[PDB]
Design a protein around this ligand. Structure first.
Ligand code: CHT
Ligand code: CHT
Ligand code: CHT
Lengths: 409, 409, 409
């Protein structure tokens, strides 16, 4: 594949250029800023595109989710993809606080989630964010600090996406305007990813120059041991339990029937690319009828956020812990809800692991140029994330036969 | 009706909760801020929607006003609905300064009306507002303070609405895009009004807690005696004179012929809901032909701002007087022109008295959470405002028979 | 013509009012600000419209440039209209620094061209601009100062215009939405130009009042001797050489064959108005086939920026030199690239010399009210600019017969 091979060949040459400058020359504090300029322009190019990508892919992802939730079968998969998303948020927050990869009020930060879901302006929500601060027996002021409001542009586009879906023929030009705006801002991300090999070369090399000790290669080992532990309690302990609670039919036999599509997800790392394969393995091996697989698998490519909350919401807390933030427990729930929501906006993006992380790091107020620690090993962890998304969707096929049995007639 | 009954039942339970907390417990200065948080989220939800509601309803209200002003009949109703709008602005400013409900340069503030009609940026006009200040033999600086520019987003959408109406078939996708955007942002205001009973419960109760003296129940009695005096010189003295100046046929006989539609407006408080009724009473009782009633009544549901300048531009000055502002005479004309213009944007909104007031209080730089004094008694005054809008439109039927008599052949 | 006669009659009455106030009365520092208020509102009206004019005319100018570059003929005119545009930028920068009309780091300002082509936000690019500053062995901070980012709204709309052109039928509603938005924001500029005679009357008169010495009538004579010298090395020395390098057929005979359309351009000063004439003189007199004139003349009305870089990028440096700026050499290339790019956005505007200058003066951070020095003599220099655009396009017809000879079969 091109986009995988070229990114690995730019991480290898990024470390090759990176140690042949710090151990072979000596740059100033200014010339280590001009050396990381082609990787600076990539971070401006990526933040440029997340505003028409959030707005267009949330409006069309939700206005096409209607008529894919027809009946009660499409409602008994929205409850399932919210019940295992909420457990994956709790499992991602617990595992990043217990392990703490990258080390050494709370009510006023949970009421800013609900304040930022409903902004006071839709144009200010594209570049500003409401943060409140207790001061003086106390009183409370609000500031509107900078940084994009991703939570309020997603709650509004989820409401605006439901309204124009149900409007019928009067709101067909609004679905057609944003379907074409979503196709046009996924062909610009394909143009940016033709520059992304050159940009991550000078982004990796600008980090190995400034790094003086190999402690950051240990915090990058405890990060892969928090993602591969979040994505191994979910595939072994959490999701085979949820199947066995309602469907008493041995969940380790269900996964062996899907072993052709689990092994295919380790080679592509894209859920919508092996979506023709997981259709072919579910019906023939597990003996499930086609009227419920065609109703939960198209909603399971928009709503299945089990893998994001264990990978991109552990990465975005690891970056925040890397900058010596204490974060409390109220700004961790702020991050893991912004990281889980931003993956619905970065829905079918080509390099959807890199783009989603630039959305959350720009939203929660972190340096987006710290994503180059994550894309060094993103090609290992995105393969295993979509093995959970394929296994999570396959258990979402065999669960809605059991709550929907009298509905099929 | 649901939206009336539920709002009265949330004002009654708002005062019931409000006196069973201040006279039964004791909250801190912080716990009186967390008690009014469900009413804070309503004020964020309302300010969220006034930006796509101003833009879409002004573009479609004006691009559909073309072909409803065909001939000279539709021009002799635009002059009439500007001549009685300007008298209602003068009558609303005089009555709120002479009575002063809620008590105890000028050239640089009239040149900021004309500066804010033509902003220097269309994206900055969505959240910022130009205020100029004389300083030092003097010189003049400009600041761009915050708060939405409603005047400049209405003057531009009035020009942009006329241009795409007259473009014909080349500008039909622009009328279709904003017709669907206006239908989609009136179905979101219907979703907000399903939360508005809960929000105004904690908004009323958060005001009765902090109020320690019943002087504010006297300033709320002088406010209803300024609206019901502005809307009783207009229906008795001003508008029956304007009929009798040009049409010498006893205006108190004209209103008795419309008594079925005046009494219907006291039960619905919506001009476009009794618009089928005022068609049926004008032609049969007053003997007016249908070629001029169908030409002045659709422009009389977009342009008839006689009732707004006596109700929502007396309320927005009463709120400004409540915060101990002196206002001069130049910032009163700023308010009553912003309040009269913002009711064309809040054109056919369900709760169009509450939404219009949040537009003007956010525009002229006032606390939008002070609208809860007004919605306590809005269900009394909005019935009597639309009785003036029905009587003002009925006299706008019997006036254009007299200036248009040779035009009908 | 109306728009020429009325503008000359407002420059004459502007100087007539201007010397009958300063030599016949005495105004304060405040009353010389209220006297130039009708010309202030014109500068707010002009800056109001450059945001939907840049966005709509760049998207439709580029999405219609596709299928006008079919084959290799339409590629051998994009190289020619970039090779003579880059020489006109170098000739405009050299001539405004050598003559310096209006008198008496660099790497951090060339890396801000590339930083401002790719902004971090599309809504902030409509009103804000990234300027970086070296400070402290040094480090580099970035600020986001105010003023519209014209470079980043043109690079994005050039990429977004190419993507929706090549999308075919899926991106036809996006071409139809911006074709109608571009027709609707050229009919608002025609409404503004009905006020522009009144606005430039009080704009000229507000400058002759404050001027106390006639040195500014000498710097306005060295400005016309830099534009008419830039547009006389291009028409005599630069462009007849580029023809004679590749096409050995005596370029002074080519221009005599186009003498009917050169003389017509001195009477209209519009390239797309004499575009039917330069078609009729190229084929009959110079004996060129119609298959290459119809392929380079529609791309030569969007891409031919030879005349802008010698007129509007010498004017925008002359205004910057007038305010006693030193500008280095890095902020001169910033101006002449912003002035050359902004003339693709002001593509077919009626008063396209006045509107283009308000775009660049607002972009590079200059007073837009200093354009009234330029529109005093714009009707002399815009005639001679389009004589170079007609001569530059005619030599762009006789050049693509020589590189395309085996392609025509
Ligand atoms: C299923 N994905 C996580 C890949 C996209 C939904 O946000
Ligand atoms: C006639 N109304 C006042 C109800 C709407 C026009 O703004
Ligand atoms: C050819 N013009 C310069 C007139 C427009 C292209 O920007």
């Amino acid at each position: 594949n091109w986009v995988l091979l070229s990114t690995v060949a730019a991480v290898v040459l990024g470390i090759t250029t990176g140690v042949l400058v710090r151990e072979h020359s000596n740059l100033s504090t200014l010339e280590k800023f001009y050396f990381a300029f082609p990787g600076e322009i990539l971070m401006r190019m990526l933040k440029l595109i997340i505003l028409p990508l959030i707005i267009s892919s949330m409006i069309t992802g939700v206005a096409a989710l209607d008529s894919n939730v027809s009946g009660k079968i499409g409602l008994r998969a929205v409850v399932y993809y919210f019940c295992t998303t909420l457990i994956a948020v709790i499992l991602g927050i617990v595992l990043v606080v217990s392990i703490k990869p990258g080390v050494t009020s709370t009510v006023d930060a949970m009421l800013d989630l609900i304040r930022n879901m409903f902004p006071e302006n839709l144009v200010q929500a594209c570049f500003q964010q409401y943060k409140t601060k207790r001061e003086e027996e106390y009183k409370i002021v609000g500031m509107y600090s900078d940084g994009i409001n991703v939570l309020g542009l997603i709650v509004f586009c989820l409401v605006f996406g439901l309204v124009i879906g149900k409007m019928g023929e009067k709101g067909q030009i609004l679905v057609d305007f944003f379907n074409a705006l979503s196709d046009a801002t996924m062909k610009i991300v394909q143009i940016i990813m033709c520059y992304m090999p050159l940009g991550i070369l000078f982004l990796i090399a600008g980090k190995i120059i400034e790094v003086e000790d190999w402690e950051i290669f240990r915090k990058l080992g405890l990060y892969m041991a928090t993602v591969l532990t979040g994505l191994a309690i979910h595939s072994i302990v959490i999701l085979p339990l949820i199947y066995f609670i309602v469907v008493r039919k041995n969940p380790f036999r269900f996964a062996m029937g899907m072993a052709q599509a689990l092994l295919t997800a380790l080679m592509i790392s894209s859920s919508s690319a092996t979506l023709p394969v997981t259709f072919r393995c579910a019906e023939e091996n597990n003996q499930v009828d086609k009227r419920i697989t065609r109703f939960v698998l198209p909603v399971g490519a928009t709503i299945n956020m089990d893998g994001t909350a264990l990978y991109e919401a552990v990465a975005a807390v690891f970056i925040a812990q890397l900058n010596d933030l204490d974060l409390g427990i109220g700004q961790i729930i702020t991050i893991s809800i912004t990281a889980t929501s931003a993956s619905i906006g970065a829905a079918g993006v080509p390099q959807a692991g890199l783009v989603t992380m630039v959305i959350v790091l720009s939203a929660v107020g972190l340096p987006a140029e710290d994503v180059t620690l994550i894309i060094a090993v993103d090609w290992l962890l995105d393969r295993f994330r979509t093995m959970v998304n394929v296994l999570g969707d396959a258990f979402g096929t065999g669960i809605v036969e059991k709550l929907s049995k009298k509905e099929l007639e």
